[PDB]
Structures are given as structure tokens and as C-alpha cells.
Design a protein around this motif. Structure first.
Motif, PDB file in Angstrom:
ATOM      1  N   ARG A 105      73.689  55.076   4.955  1.00  0.00           N
ATOM      2  CA  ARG A 105      72.972  54.058   3.267  1.00  0.00           C
ATOM      3  C   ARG A 105      72.643  53.131   4.020  1.00  0.00           C
ATOM      4  NH1 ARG A 105      73.882  53.539  -2.356  1.00  0.00           N
ATOM      5  NH2 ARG A 105      72.021  56.068  -1.787  1.00  0.00           N
ATOM      6  N   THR A 106      73.309  52.051   4.700  1.00  0.00           N
ATOM      7  CA  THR A 106      73.053  51.422   5.722  1.00  0.00           C
ATOM      8  C   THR A 106      71.535  50.954   6.155  1.00  0.00           C
ATOM      9  OG1 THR A 106      75.159  49.964   5.993  1.00  0.00           O
ATOM     10  CG2 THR A 106      73.549  49.247   6.929  1.00  0.00           C
ATOM     11  N   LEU A 107      71.675  52.693   7.286  1.00  0.00           N
ATOM     12  CA  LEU A 107      70.296  52.654   8.158  1.00  0.00           C
ATOM     13  C   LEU A 107      69.124  53.039   7.064  1.00  0.00           C
ATOM     14  CD1 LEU A 107      71.226  54.487  11.205  1.00  0.00           C
ATOM     15  CD2 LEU A 107      70.964  51.733  10.405  1.00  0.00           C
ATOM     16  N   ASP A 108      69.411  53.574   6.100  1.00  0.00           N
ATOM     17  CA  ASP A 108      68.591  53.943   4.812  1.00  0.00           C
ATOM     18  C   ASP A 108      68.140  52.882   3.758  1.00  0.00           C
ATOM     19  OD1 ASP A 108      69.806  57.033   3.643  1.00  0.00           O
ATOM     20  OD2 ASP A 108      67.789  56.441   5.161  1.00  0.00           O
ATOM     21  N   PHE A 109      68.928  51.394   3.751  1.00  0.00           N
ATOM     22  CA  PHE A 109      68.657  50.236   2.892  1.00  0.00           C
ATOM     23  C   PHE A 109      67.512  49.273   3.832  1.00  0.00           C
ATOM     24  CE2 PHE A 109      70.749  46.076   2.608  1.00  0.00           C
ATOM     25  CZ  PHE A 109      69.967  45.641   1.490  1.00  0.00           C
ATOM     26  N   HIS A 110      68.102  49.439   5.178  1.00  0.00           N
ATOM     27  CA  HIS A 110      66.782  48.577   5.782  1.00  0.00           C
ATOM     28  C   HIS A 110      65.343  49.452   5.894  1.00  0.00           C
ATOM     29  CE1 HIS A 110      69.928  45.356   7.480  1.00  0.00           C
ATOM     30  NE2 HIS A 110      70.344  46.799   8.040  1.00  0.00           N
ATOM     31  N   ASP A 111      65.504  50.468   5.456  1.00  0.00           N
ATOM     32  CA  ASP A 111      64.504  51.067   5.316  1.00  0.00           C
ATOM     33  C   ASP A 111      63.487  50.907   3.967  1.00  0.00           C
ATOM     34  OD1 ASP A 111      63.336  54.752   5.993  1.00  0.00           O
ATOM     35  OD2 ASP A 111      62.367  52.887   6.132  1.00  0.00           O
ATOM     36  N   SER A 112      65.025  51.345   3.306  1.00  0.00           N
ATOM     37  CA  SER A 112      63.312  50.106   1.723  1.00  0.00           C
ATOM     38  C   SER A 112      63.504  48.972   2.341  1.00  0.00           C
ATOM     39  CB  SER A 112      64.608  50.391   0.906  1.00  0.00           C
ATOM     40  OG  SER A 112      64.418  50.573   0.001  1.00  0.00           O
ATOM     41  N   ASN A 113      64.277  48.377   3.078  1.00  0.00           N
ATOM     42  CA  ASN A 113      63.675  46.910   2.613  1.00  0.00           C
ATOM     43  C   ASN A 113      62.481  46.864   3.159  1.00  0.00           C
ATOM     44  OD1 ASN A 113      66.019  45.929   1.461  1.00  0.00           O
ATOM     45  ND2 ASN A 113      67.222  45.733   3.157  1.00  0.00           N
ATOM     46  N   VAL A 114      62.335  47.631   4.266  1.00  0.00           N
ATOM     47  CA  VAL A 114      60.638  47.289   4.939  1.00  0.00           C
ATOM     48  C   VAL A 114      59.712  48.079   4.320  1.00  0.00           C
ATOM     49  CG1 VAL A 114      59.103  47.849   6.714  1.00  0.00           C
ATOM     50  CG2 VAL A 114      61.455  47.178   7.412  1.00  0.00           C
ATOM     51  N   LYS A 115      59.760  48.885   3.774  1.00  0.00           N
ATOM     52  CA  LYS A 115      58.566  49.479   2.819  1.00  0.00           C
ATOM     53  C   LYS A 115      58.442  48.777   1.426  1.00  0.00           C
ATOM     54  CE  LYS A 115      57.207  53.614  -0.446  1.00  0.00           C
ATOM     55  NZ  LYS A 115      56.877  52.755  -2.080  1.00  0.00           N
ATOM     56  N   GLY A 131      63.528  58.278   8.446  1.00  0.00           N
ATOM     57  CA  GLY A 131      64.179  57.619   7.914  1.00  0.00           C
ATOM     58  C   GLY A 131      63.591  58.356   5.711  1.00  0.00           C
ATOM     59  N   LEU A 132      64.884  57.891   4.991  1.00  0.00           N
ATOM     60  CA  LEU A 132      64.616  58.380   3.813  1.00  0.00           C
ATOM     61  C   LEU A 132      63.681  57.431   3.226  1.00  0.00           C
ATOM     62  CD1 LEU A 132      67.687  58.935   1.304  1.00  0.00           C
ATOM     63  CD2 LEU A 132      66.170  60.230   2.141  1.00  0.00           C
ATOM     64  N   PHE A 133      62.816  56.634   3.641  1.00  0.00           N
ATOM     65  CA  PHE A 133      61.553  55.608   2.682  1.00  0.00           C
ATOM     66  C   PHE A 133      60.906  55.881   3.749  1.00  0.00           C
ATOM     67  CE2 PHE A 133      64.136  54.745  -0.796  1.00  0.00           C
ATOM     68  CZ  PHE A 133      64.972  55.028  -0.417  1.00  0.00           C
ATOM     69  N   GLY A 134      60.526  56.331   4.475  1.00  0.00           N
ATOM     70  CA  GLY A 134      59.714  56.482   5.915  1.00  0.00           C
ATOM     71  C   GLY A 134      58.682  55.432   6.321  1.00  0.00           C
ATOM     72  N   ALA A 135      59.423  54.178   6.532  1.00  0.00           N
ATOM     73  CA  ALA A 135      59.196  53.282   7.139  1.00  0.00           C
ATOM     74  C   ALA A 135      59.540  52.609   8.505  1.00  0.00           C
ATOM     75  CB  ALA A 135      59.586  51.812   6.311  1.00  0.00           C
ATOM     76  N   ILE A 136      60.625  52.634   8.342  1.00  0.00           N
ATOM     77  CA  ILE A 136      61.040  52.465   9.972  1.00  0.00           C
ATOM     78  C   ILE A 136      61.029  53.760  10.993  1.00  0.00           C
ATOM     79  CG2 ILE A 136      63.151  52.079  11.331  1.00  0.00           C
ATOM     80  CD1 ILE A 136      64.157  50.067   9.041  1.00  0.00           C
ATOM     81  N   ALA A 137      60.525  53.679  12.032  1.00  0.00           N
ATOM     82  CA  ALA A 137      60.213  54.991  12.544  1.00  0.00           C
ATOM     83  C   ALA A 137      59.226  55.675  11.961  1.00  0.00           C
ATOM     84  CB  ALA A 137      61.078  55.296  13.366  1.00  0.00           C
ATOM     85  N   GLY A 138      58.723  55.015  11.014  1.00  0.00           N
ATOM     86  CA  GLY A 138      57.759  56.902   9.620  1.00  0.00           C
ATOM     87  C   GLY A 138      55.624  55.535  10.617  1.00  0.00           C
ATOM     88  N   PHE A 139      55.675  55.326   9.063  1.00  0.00           N
ATOM     89  CA  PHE A 139      54.146  54.780   8.925  1.00  0.00           C
ATOM     90  C   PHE A 139      54.029  53.614   9.402  1.00  0.00           C
ATOM     91  CE2 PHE A 139      55.876  52.289   4.954  1.00  0.00           C
ATOM     92  CZ  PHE A 139      54.834  51.090   5.400  1.00  0.00           C
ATOM     93  N   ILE A 140      55.760  52.593   9.568  1.00  0.00           N
ATOM     94  CA  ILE A 140      55.508  51.618  10.821  1.00  0.00           C
ATOM     95  C   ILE A 140      56.124  52.231  12.490  1.00  0.00           C
ATOM     96  CG2 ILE A 140      56.312  49.436  11.251  1.00  0.00           C
ATOM     97  CD1 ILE A 140      55.909  49.316   7.814  1.00  0.00           C
ATOM     98  N   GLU A 141      55.501  52.478  13.211  1.00  0.00           N
ATOM     99  CA  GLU A 141      56.196  53.464  14.328  1.00  0.00           C
ATOM    100  C   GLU A 141      56.941  52.705  15.081  1.00  0.00           C
ATOM    101  OE1 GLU A 141      53.126  55.992  15.717  1.00  0.00           O
ATOM    102  OE2 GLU A 141      51.478  54.692  16.523  1.00  0.00           O
ATOM    103  N   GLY A 142      58.002  52.242  15.354  1.00  0.00           N
ATOM    104  CA  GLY A 142      58.291  51.186  16.180  1.00  0.00           C
ATOM    105  C   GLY A 142      57.891  50.014  15.614  1.00  0.00           C
ATOM    106  N   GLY A 143      59.032  49.348  16.381  1.00  0.00           N
ATOM    107  CA  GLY A 143      59.574  47.989  15.652  1.00  0.00           C
ATOM    108  C   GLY A 143      59.423  47.123  16.663  1.00  0.00           C
ATOM    109  N   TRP A 144      58.794  45.318  16.024  1.00  0.00           N
ATOM    110  CA  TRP A 144      59.386  44.397  17.431  1.00  0.00           C
ATOM    111  C   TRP A 144      60.172  43.703  18.109  1.00  0.00           C
ATOM    112  CZ3 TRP A 144      56.191  42.107  12.348  1.00  0.00           C
ATOM    113  CH2 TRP A 144      54.379  42.734  12.169  1.00  0.00           C
ATOM    114  N   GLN A 145      59.445  43.928  19.697  1.00  0.00           N
ATOM    115  CA  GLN A 145      60.693  42.948  19.762  1.00  0.00           C
ATOM    116  C   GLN A 145      60.450  41.324  19.984  1.00  0.00           C
ATOM    117  OE1 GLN A 145      62.701  45.703  21.968  1.00  0.00           O
ATOM    118  NE2 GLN A 145      63.541  44.079  23.443  1.00  0.00           N
ATOM    119  N   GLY A 146      59.658  40.981  19.477  1.00  0.00           N
ATOM    120  CA  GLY A 146      58.642  39.676  20.163  1.00  0.00           C
ATOM    121  C   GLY A 146      58.503  39.008  17.643  1.00  0.00           C
ATOM    122  N   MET A 147      59.899  39.734  17.219  1.00  0.00           N
ATOM    123  CA  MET A 147      60.289  39.386  15.669  1.00  0.00           C
ATOM    124  C   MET A 147      61.530  39.093  16.138  1.00  0.00           C
ATOM    125  SD  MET A 147      59.503  39.575  11.883  1.00  0.00           S
ATOM    126  CE  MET A 147      61.135  40.918  11.879  1.00  0.00           C
TER     127      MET A 147
END
Ligand SMILES: *[C@@H]1O[C@H](CO)[C@@H](O[C@@H]2O[C@H](CO)[C@@H](O)[C@H](O)[C@H]2NC(C)=O)[C@H](O)[C@H]1NC(C)=O
Ligand code: NAG
Lengths: 177, 56
Positions: free
Chosen positions: A106-116, A1-17
Motif C-alpha cells: 500500500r505504501t509503495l502504491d501510495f507514492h506511485d499514486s502521489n506522483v500520478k 505499479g498500480l498507478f503506472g507512474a513510478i517506474a512506468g510512464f516516468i521511467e526512473g527517478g531523480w538522484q538530483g531532487m
């Protein structure tokens, strides 16, 4: 992703949140656990909600075909009518499809930004009272119980209050034990 | 439909308080009934082979 957070330096997300889109996992003497960040998740819902409303609204006026009949010696205007009406269905289909594709990115990149940004929020609260481990996590140089954790989660972490304990631990680590 | 003759129909919208005056000498197909335009509004002539669906 443009912001490198989702599926980037954070590899994969949390089923448990389960109670938000972005949040925290913590681990200390009293245990471990997940916790959503209400404020970021809310800004995101606000954004996406407004987006979906703006799309509906801008597509509100848009070409509406009407039937007109023509006789066998009005073929030139029947053709001009068909083409005019097809011409608008095409302009409008392109507009809807392209708006959808462009806004999805933009939406997918928005979330990525939000996690960064949330990661960076925690980063600049803790500073050198914690060590960036590189996978989305911080390891504290001081003991951080559930009250201290919440202070990280809600914007209230007092750096000065732990920095002494922090400098002693960093000291032990550089010295080798 | 078995006929070599032809019938050619014509029409007009006759405003309130106005009259239509015919005169003829042959080949006239005269009005008996005509239509008052009782209400105007949105409609359309749909082209469909389908039938009434008893629905809304
Ligand atoms: C159709 O009939 C009416 C009478 O029933 C005519 O009404 C008169 O028309 C004149 C001219 O248009 C008006 O100025 C008057 O208000 C009406 N006069 C009277 C005495 O009522 C009308 O003229 C007739 N229309 C035509 C085309 O002949
Ligand atoms: C944030 O966290 C601390 C818990 O350590 C709590 O006492 C404080 O009241 C919280 N502040 C807000 C505004 O929720």
C-alpha cells in the motif's frame, strides 16, 4: 505499479531532487533546475508517519507468555500450556508479518499514486497551453520564465493569461512553419 | 544421596491473626524459621544458566 507512474510512464527517478519525494524539473531560457513539491511530500510524510504510529499502537496489546511449572504427572496440562502459548506466538507472528507485507504494498502504491496525481495537477492547470510529451514532461506553447514556472509549482498558473500566445504557437505548428 | 528414607515437606500461608497448631507423636520435622511476605509485586522465576552481569 498500480498507478503506472513510478517506474512506468516516468521511467526512473531523480538522484538530483534531494529535498522531497516528488517534485519538478524545469527548463527555460534562464536555465534549468529541480524543485521539490512541499505539499505532496508533506501529505505523504503525514500518511506514512501515521501508518507507522498506528502499527505500533495496534501491536501494543498482544500475547505475553508467562512461565508455569508442572510436575511429572501433570504432563497433559503442561502440553496444553505449551500449545496454548505457542499458539499465540504463532497468531501474533502471522499478524505482524502479514500486516507488514500488506502495508508495504500500500505504501509503495501510495507514492506511485502521489506522483500520478501531481502529474495530473500540472496537466489540468496547463491544458492545451502545453503539449504532453509522454515521459512525464510538458512542453509549453508559450514562453515560461521562472515566475511562470513557480505559478505551475504552487497551484497559481493563470491559463487565460497565456492562451493567446498559446493559440498562436499551436497555429504555427499545424501550418508547418 | 545414600539414603533410603524419605522426607516430605508441606506448607501453608498463615493469615495475620491466625494460628497453626501442630500435634505429633513421631516423624515430625518442625519449623524453626518461617517467612513474612513483606512485599508483593510483579516477578517471575526465570530459567537461565547465566550469571549476574553487573548491569541494568
Ligand atoms: C492470636 O492472638 C490474638 C491475641 O494476641 C487473638 O486475638 C483475639 O482474637 C479474637 C478472635 O479472633 C478477636 O476477635 C480479638 O480481637 C482478639 N482478642 C483479644 C483479647 O485481643 C487471636 O484470636 C489469636 N488467634 C487464634 C487463631 O487463636
Ligand atoms: C505562487 O507563485 C507566484 C510566482 O509567479 C508568486 O508570486 C505567488 O506569490 C506564489 N503564491 C504563493 C501562495 O506562494
Amino acid at each position: 505499479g498500480l498507478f503506472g507512474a513510478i517506474a512506468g510512464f516516468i521511467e526512473g527517478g531523480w538522484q538530483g531532487m534531494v529535498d522531497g519525494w516528488y517534485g519538478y524539473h524545469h527548463s527555460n531560457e534562464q536555465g534549468s533546475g529541480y524543485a521539490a513539491d512541499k505539499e505532496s511530500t508533506q501529505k505523504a510524510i503525514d500518511g506514512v508517519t501515521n501508518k507507522v504510529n498506528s502499527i505500533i499502537d495496534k501491536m501494543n496489546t498482544q500475547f505475553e507468555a508467562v512461565g508455569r511449572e508442572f510436575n511429572n504427572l501433570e504432563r497433559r496440562i503442561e502440553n496444553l500450556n505449551k500449545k496454548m502459548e505457542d499458539g499465540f506466538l504463532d497468531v501474533w507472528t502471522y499478524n505482524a508479518e502479514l500486516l507488514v507485507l500488506m502495508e508495504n504494498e500500500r505504501t509503495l502504491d501510495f507514492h506511485d499514486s502521489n506522483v500520478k496525481n501531481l502529474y495530473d495537477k500540472v496537466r489540468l492547470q496547463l491544458r492545451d497551453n502545453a503539449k504532453e510529451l509522454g515521459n512525464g514532461c510538458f512542453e509549453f506553447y508559450h514562453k515560461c520564465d521562472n515566475e511562470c514556472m513557480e505559478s505551475v509549482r504552487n497551484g497559481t498558473y493563470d491559463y487565460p493569461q497565456y492562451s493567446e500566445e498559446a493559440r498562436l504557437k499551436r497555429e504555427e505548428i499545424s501550418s508547418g512553419r | 544421596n545414600g539414603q533410603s528414607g524419605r522426607m516430605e515437606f508441606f506448607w501453608t500461608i498463615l493469615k495475620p491473626n491466625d494460628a497453626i497448631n501442630f500435634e505429633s507423636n513421631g516423624n515430625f520435622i518442625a519449623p524453626e524459621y518461617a517467612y513474612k511476605i513483606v512485599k508483593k509485586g510483579d516477578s517471575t522465576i526465570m530459567k537461565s544458566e547465566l550469571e549476574y552481569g553487573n548491569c541494568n
